[PDB]
Amino acid sequence: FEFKYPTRELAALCAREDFEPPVARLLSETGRQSRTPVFVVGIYSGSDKLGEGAASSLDHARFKAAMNALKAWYLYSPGENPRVPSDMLEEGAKPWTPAYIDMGEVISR
RNA sequence: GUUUGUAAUAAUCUAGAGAUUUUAAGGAACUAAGUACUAAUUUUAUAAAAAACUGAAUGAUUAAUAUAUCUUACA
Ligand SMILES: [Mg+2]
Ligand SMILES: [Mg+2]
Numbered sequence: 001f002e003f004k005y006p007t008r009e010l011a012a013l014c015a016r017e018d019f020e021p022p023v024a025r026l027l028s029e030t031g032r033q034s035r036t037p038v039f040v041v042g043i044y045s046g047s048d049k050l051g052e053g054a055a056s057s058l059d060h061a062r063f064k065a066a067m068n069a070l071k072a073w074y075l076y077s078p079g080e081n082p083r084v085p086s087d088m089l090e091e092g093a094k095p096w097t098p099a100y101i102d103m104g105e106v107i108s109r
Numbered sequence: 110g111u112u113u114g115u116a117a118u119a120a121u122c123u124a125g126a127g128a129u130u131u132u133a134a135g136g137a138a139c140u141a142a143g144u145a146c147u148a149a150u151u152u153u154a155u156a157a158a159a160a161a162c163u164g165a166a167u168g169a170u171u172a173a174u175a176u177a178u179c180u181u182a183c184a
Contacts, residue, residue, distance in 0.1 A: 033163065
């Protein structure tokens with residue numbers, strides 16, 4: 001994954017799914033006014049925590065938190081060893097259950 | 110200035126080694142001041158690499174974008 005303006009893609013995702021607008025919140029911090037600080041930022045849509053990222057800058061920590069929120073959306077997995085439609089060709093197989101079909105990747109500014 | 114000490118020549122005196130006068134003379138490693146007389150004097154000698162990170166405050170300038178499609182315009 002290589003993101004470009006991940007903060008806009010996450011705002012567009014929440015808008016598409018009708019989630020509350022994403023708000024970045026400082027969960028923890030230490031070393032502000034130092035050479036290697038640690039800002040732990042978490043992006044919430046209402047009261048639910050979507051993603052979190054820890055970086056040495058406030059902006060970077062906010063971008064890293066949005067990227068991790070988008071990865072969690074794209075890297076959703078129903079299971080590690082899921083059934084494949086090719087399994088029905090092998091006779092003697094259980095009935096096929098409809099799989100999850102996504103709408104498509106978010107297109108943002 | 111300080112220091113050393115009264116040069117030579119000349120005049121006079123002297124058995125003659127010398128004396129007197131011109132003579133506070135003539136010198137001088139030194140000190141101070143003044144003076145550009147001498148030397149600081151040959152056509153871009155050498156070295157020196159040169160503005161970090163995060164937060165905060167406060168400015169300037171700017172596409173600081175994405176998706177679909179393969180034709181579009183001119184002649
Ligand atoms: Mg004297
Ligand atoms: Mg700096």
